[PDB]
Write a protein that binds this DNA or RNA. Structure first.
Ligand code: SR
Length: 119
RNA sequence: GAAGCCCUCACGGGCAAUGUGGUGUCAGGGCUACCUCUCAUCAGCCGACCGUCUCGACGAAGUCUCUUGGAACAGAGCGUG
């Protein structure tokens, strides 16, 4: 909420999670705020997800600005456990990063595009 | 970066991407590229001597004479470990 600066429509979040699921099956994805953080720093990240029900918020507060000064596009998910399920985890995930999609590159592109428009 | 931990005989359950586990800890470390090599460390297995304290077993040689005395464990004489 303090790091969130725009609401994402359930529909968009839907497409993003699906795109993320086919990303792990095909391409490569990072699970965890730390791994997600290094990817954004090493530049090996295409799309990073960030849960919105993260408490404490400090764990993810840095993702937004870090992503901006790195061109890396990012999107919010209303729930932490979905992101983890989608990321293929048996647990939750405060943040996620698609380290190069996989037969989803097309979708990822649009989502990023759609997001930028959503400001 | 799930390669992990806990409970249960098992089935199964719980924990864990807000990081279990690997690596590492100033002879700094890590990574990339090399040489060599380990007996350092950490973990676990086995597992005492001796010594000290206490307890216990075993363990030599007179119960001879006279006198005094209620009593010899005394005096005098002979004898022993
Ligand atoms: Sr959780």
């Amino acid at each position: 909420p303090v790091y969130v600066d725009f609401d994402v429509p359930a529909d968009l979040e839907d497409d993003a999670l699906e795109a993320l699921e086919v990303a792990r099956d095909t391409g490569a994805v990072k699970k965890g705020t730390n791994e997600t953080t290094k990817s954004i720093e090493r530049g090996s990240a295409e799309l990073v997800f960030v849960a919105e029900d993260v408490q404490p918020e400090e764990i993810v507060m840095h993702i937004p600005e870090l992503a901006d000064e790195k061109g890396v596009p990012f999107i919010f998910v209303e729930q932490q456990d979905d992101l983890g399920h989608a990321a293929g985890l048996e647990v939750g995930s405060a943040a996620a990063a698609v380290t190069d999609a996989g037969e989803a590159d097309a979708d990822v592109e649009d989502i990023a595009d759609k997001v930028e428009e959503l400001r």
